[PDB]
Write a structure and sequence with these properties.
The protein is α+β, with helices and mostly antiparallel strands. Helix content is 30%, strand content 21%.
Length: 451
């Protein structure tokens, strides 16, 4: 007859109970509701064991089966808790989500209510005026208010500082409660894996918009490098998207793919002269560079000279539909040399410095921490298996023909790296999949089934 302490988080009231290993979780919860006497809606409350970071959800299991013994300290706490999510468009949305669900499932439910297909590509990332949803508002891009906003958060980083952000990717196989996430905390919702399956304008207005927004901020903040010519084309595309995204007279077509010829100001062919195509459908633009290029451009060049280069690039964009332009922006980003690599600090045998391991959808890359250069590449198509040695925090990947790669990371980075490798192998299976729905069972096997 050992003692069981229970703190009720939303009442801030403690309760002791005399129990055996053979008492059921349901019995503790029913016993606990009596001893309190006060009656309220308990339906969302579950037992949580902070010491072992374990939810005690199965009411028909014994304390013994969950491993609880003398003077164990539990919380009786709501499973659902407020979370602030920062979307790829940098707006915050408040959601009350189940802090006992696996993060993979939480992300799936978030993406379902946001109408984002392929939730397996997205996840939650810890951070280093909340948006109230309107119909289809997550499909709508806005211009940036101010160069100041951009200039402010434009704090350029070395690759090593960029690699440290990746320590914060949540474990998809554990709940938010298990990962030191608190009520009212802000998490980033991001595209995590850079292998985007079947982007389809017919179904994916929101998915394409949020992916475009993630790309746009990465380019404007120089988190990914591009050439000056590419920057001028990114500027022309953003200008065109911003202009088409004005829809004053309708609220119900946010998910539609707007055509230039549909804009109120558009001139029909043959309206001005029986010479079609002699003038632009939009006769007048208002291109200015300040919110279309990264801050380094306005330091290098006169406003007039940047404007002329954007106008030159815009010649190619002016007849694109809204979603066509977003997809061309995404396709130009996908073509960038360092696209789709996630960096981790790593040490290699014979290395005297911190280096990087880069993970991409099809390969691992040993990379220089101060140039970003690819020193060596190993292909997933050659991978047999991998080992995590938790005592020395060493990942060893085995490839065909007796090729082995070993590197050392922080313990947190090892866990994140393991999930990225399994996650990308899981994503590579989607092309051959004959199931109607996502094979979540295989995802969990490839990422958490082993260790």
């Amino acid at each position: 007859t050992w003692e069981l302490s229970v703190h009720v988080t939303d009442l801030n009231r403690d309760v002791t109970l005399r129990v055996t290993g053979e008492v059921h979780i349901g019995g503790v919860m029913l016993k606990l509701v009596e001893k309190l006497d006060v009656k309220k809606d308990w339906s969302d409350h579950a037992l949580w064991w902070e010491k072992k970071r374990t939810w005690l959800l199965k009411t028909h299991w014994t304390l013994d089966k969950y491993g609880i013994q003398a003077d164990a300290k539990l919380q009786f706490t709501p499973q659902h808790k407020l979370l602030r999510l920062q979307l790829p468009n940098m707006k915050y949305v408040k959601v009350k989500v189940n802090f006992s669900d696996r993060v993979f499932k939480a992300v799936s439910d978030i993406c379902k209510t946001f109408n984002i297909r392929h939730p397996e590509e997205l996840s939650l990332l810890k951070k280093p005026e909340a948006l109230e949803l309107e119909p289809g508002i997550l499909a709508v891009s806005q211009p940036i208010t101010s160069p100041e906003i951009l200039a402010k958060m434009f704090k350029p980083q070395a690759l090593l500082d960029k690699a440290k952000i990746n320590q914060g990717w949540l474990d998809s196989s554990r709940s938010l409660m298990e990962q030191d996430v608190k009520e009212n905390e802000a998490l980033l919702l991001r595209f995590k894996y850079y292998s985007f399956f079947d982007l389809n304008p017919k179904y994916d207005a929101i998915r394409i918009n949020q992916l475009y927004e993630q790309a746009k901020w990465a380019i404007l903040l120089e988190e990914i490098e591009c050439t000056e010519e590419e920057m001028m084309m990114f500027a022309a595309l953003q200008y065109h998207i911003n202009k088409l995204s004005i829809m004053t007279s309708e609220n119900h077509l946010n998910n539609s793919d707007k055509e230039v010829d549909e804009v109120d100001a558009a001139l029909s062919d043959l309206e001005i002269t029986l010479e079609g195509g002699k003038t632009s459908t939009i006769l007048t633009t208002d291109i200015t560079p300040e919110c279309l290029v990264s801050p380094r451009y306005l330091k290098k060049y006169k406003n007039k000279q940047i404007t002329a280069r954007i106008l030159e690039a815009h010649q190619n964009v002016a007849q694109m539909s809204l979603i066509e332009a977003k997809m061309r922006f995404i396709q130009a980003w996908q073509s960038l040399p360092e696209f789709g690599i996630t960096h981790f600090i790593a040490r290699f045998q014979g290395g005297k410095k911190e280096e990087l391991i880069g993970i991409a959808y099809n390969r691992l890359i040993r990379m220089d921490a101060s140039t970003g250069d690819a020193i060596k590449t190993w292909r997933f198509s050659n991978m047999k298996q991998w080992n995590v040695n938790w005592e020395i925090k060493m990942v060893t990947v085995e490839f065909a023909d007796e090729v082995r790669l070993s590197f050392i990371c922080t313990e947190v980075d090892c866990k994140v790296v393991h999930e990225f490798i399994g996650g990308y192998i899981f994503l590579s299976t989607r092309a051959k999949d004959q199931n109607e729905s996502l094979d979540e069972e295989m995802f969990y096997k490839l990422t958490s089934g082993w260790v």
